[PDB]
Amino acid sequence: QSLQDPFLNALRRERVPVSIYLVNGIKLQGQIESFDQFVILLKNTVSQMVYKHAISTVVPSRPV
Amino acid sequence: QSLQDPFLNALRRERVPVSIYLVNGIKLQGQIESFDQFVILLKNTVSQMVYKHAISTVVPSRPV
Amino acid sequence: QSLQDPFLNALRRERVPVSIYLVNGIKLQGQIESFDQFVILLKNTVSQMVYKHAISTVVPSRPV
Amino acid sequence: QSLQDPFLNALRRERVPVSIYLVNGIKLQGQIESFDQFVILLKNTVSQMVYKHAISTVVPSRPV
Amino acid sequence: QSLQDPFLNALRRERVPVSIYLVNGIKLQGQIESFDQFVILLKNTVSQMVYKHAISTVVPSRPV
Amino acid sequence: QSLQDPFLNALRRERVPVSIYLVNGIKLQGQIESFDQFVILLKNTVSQMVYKHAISTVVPSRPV
RNA sequence: AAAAAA
RNA sequence: AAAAAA
RNA sequence: AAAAAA
Numbered sequence: 001q002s003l004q005d006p007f008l009n010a011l012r013r014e015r016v017p018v019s020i021y022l023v024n025g026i027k028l029q030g031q032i033e034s035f036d037q038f039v040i041l042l043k044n045t046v047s048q049m050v051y052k053h054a055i056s057t058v059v060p061s062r063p064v
Numbered sequence: 065q066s067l068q069d070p071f072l073n074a075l076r077r078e079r080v081p082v083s084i085y086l087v088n089g090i091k092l093q094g095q096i097e098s099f100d101q102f103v104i105l106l107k108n109t110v111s112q113m114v115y116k117h118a119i120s121t122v123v124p125s126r127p128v
Numbered sequence: 129q130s131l132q133d134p135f136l137n138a139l140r141r142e143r144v145p146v147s148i149y150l151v152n153g154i155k156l157q158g159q160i161e162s163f164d165q166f167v168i169l170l171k172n173t174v175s176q177m178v179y180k181h182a183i184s185t186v187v188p189s190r191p192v
Numbered sequence: 193q194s195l196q197d198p199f200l201n202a203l204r205r206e207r208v209p210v211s212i213y214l215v216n217g218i219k220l221q222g223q224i225e226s227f228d229q230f231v232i233l234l235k236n237t238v239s240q241m242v243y244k245h246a247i248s249t250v251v252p253s254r255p256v
Numbered sequence: 257q258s259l260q261d262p263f264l265n266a267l268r269r270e271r272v273p274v275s276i277y278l279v280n281g282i283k284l285q286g287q288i289e290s291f292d293q294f295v296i297l298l299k300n301t302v303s304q305m306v307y308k309h310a311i312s313t314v315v316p317s318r319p320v
Numbered sequence: 321q322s323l324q325d326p327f328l329n330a331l332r333r334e335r336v337p338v339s340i341y342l343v344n345g346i347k348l349q350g351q352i353e354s355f356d357q358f359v360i361l362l363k364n365t366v367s368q369m370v371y372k373h374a375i376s377t378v379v380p381s382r383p384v
Numbered sequence: 385a386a387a388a389a390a
Numbered sequence: 391a392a393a394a395a396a
Numbered sequence: 397a398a399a400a401a402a
Contacts, residue, residue: 003100007113022184023118024153025088025388026391036131044390046191049135052115054151054184056086056388059112067228071241087246089216089385089401108387120214120246120385121402127238150312152281153389153391164259172393176315177263179308182279184391185390195356199369215374217344217400218385236402244371248342248400251368278376280345281394282397292323300396302383305327310343310376312394345395345397364399376397377396 008035010064018042021056072099074128085120136163138192149184200227202256210234213248264291266320274298277312328355330384341376 011018012032020028020042030044040050040058075082076096084092084106094108104114104122139146140160148156148170158172168178168186203210204224212220212234222236232242232250267274268288276284276298286300296306296314331338332352340348340362350364360370360378 001100003098003105004103004113007103007105019388021388022391023087023151024184024391025090025386026153026184026390027388028185028390028391030390034131036129039132039135041131041135046188048185048187048390049132050185051180051183053117053181055115056088056090056118057092057112057114059387060110063110065228067226067233068231068241071231071233083385085385085402086388087215088388089218090388091385092387094387112387116243117245119243120216120218121220121240121242123240123385123402124238147391149390149391150394151279152312152394154281154312154394155391156313156393158393162259164257167260167263169259169263174316174319176313176393177260178313179311181309182312187390187391193356195354195361196359196369199359199361211400213400214385215343216385217346217398218402219400220385220402222402240402245373247371248344248346248374249348249368249370251399252366255366275394277394278397279343280376280397281392282345282376282396283394284377284396284397286396290323292321295324295327297323297327302380304377304379304396305324306377307372307375309373315393339397341396341397342400344400346400347397348399350399368399379396379397 007064008032008040008058011060014064016064017061019059019061020050021059022054023056072096072104072122075122075124078128080128081125083123083125084114085123086118087120136160136168136186139186139188142192144192145189147187147189148178149187150182151184199256200224200232200250203252206256208256209253211251211253212242213251214246215248263320264288264296264314267316270320272320273317275315275317276306277315278310279312328352328360328378331378331380334384336384337381339379339381340370341379342374343376
């Protein structure tokens with residue numbers, strides 16, 4: 001089992017806007033387009049690839 | 065045996081408010097809803113997913 | 129399936145200029161010549177080898 | 193075999209006060225209460241869980 | 257296969273002066289003397305051991 | 321073959337004073353008493369345990 | 385120990 | 391989101 | 397390349 005995947009899959013399904021905060025404190029904003037074991041694709045004006053190892057937190061702008 | 069799971073599990077069941085300190089010094093506050101091998105679910109205004117690799121310390125508010 | 133390889137591979141073939149952001153905020157600019165499991169080859173004035181573990185994000189200049 | 197465990201077990205056994213310095217330079221102080229493969233429990237006024245991956249050094253306040 | 261090793265082996269063979277930038281932005285300069293799976297030996301006035309996990313980029317002072 | 325063990329082992333036996341630089345720039349000074357897969361034992365006023373994952377470079381004072 | 389420098 | 395504090 | 401911002 002897991003908990004990371006159902007959490008991310010939910011923000012993906014529901015198109016909820018998230019804030020992904022990186023290990024350096026930088027805050028990226030957009031929507032989970034998709035993800036795998038090591039990365040998350042984050043869509044704003046463009047899709048960008050975010051390595052998971054650089055992520056602190058994934059915060060939804062509203063509950064799930 | 066494990067030490068991480070029992071400690072985290074006790075804060076979970078006992079609804080103990082914790083400060084989670086990140087590798088960059090930032091202090092997150094809330095309660096542990098659940099956790100898995102790589103992430104912890106922290107509830108305050110909302111539930112954010114916190115990656116364990118970004119965590120320094122998990123500090124209880126009261127002794128457990 | 130993978131998500132990291134197809135995304136990186138598309139920027140490679142389509143000669144798409146990318147910004148690579150490091151875990152320390154520094155933005156590297158250039159094009160992806162190639163990559164493997166642990167590193168990415170980035171071309172600008174020269175080819176530098178960038179370790180994936182030092183990468184936060186890989187941001188395309190145009191959508192892909 | 194190992195060397196990390198006999199070292200920590202000694203500071204635990206002997207109740208020696210230690211300084212654990214984190215990767216961000218922060219200095220935590222207390223006594224090793226216990227540890228496993230990934231974390232160390234550090235007792236001061238409260239016990240807190242310190243992930244090993246966030247640790248630079250474990251310095252005793254006196255030789256072992 | 258790989259791509260990291262042929263790249264480093266080339267800078268080693270050809271005695272090309274490199275700049276190795278660390279995850280903290282510090283820039284070390286010298287020549288790859290040798291390397292393994294986890295470290296690179298960098299020769300200037302003295303040889304020093306650089307852990308790979310602390311490296312951002314390996315930049316040649318001229319193309320390969 | 322390994323490269324890390326022979327280099328570290330030579331500084332150990334030859335009692336060579338080394339500077340150990342952390343991923344945060346801090347320079348530790350002393351001598352290598354011993355080391356294992358994950359940690360290095362550094363002696364100055366006392367022996368501190370230094371986690372390898374927190375190390376950038378190990379720099380000898382004299383050539384070895 | 386900056387609830388966090390797109 | 392300092393093409394980068396030997 | 398801050399022997400180290402509980």
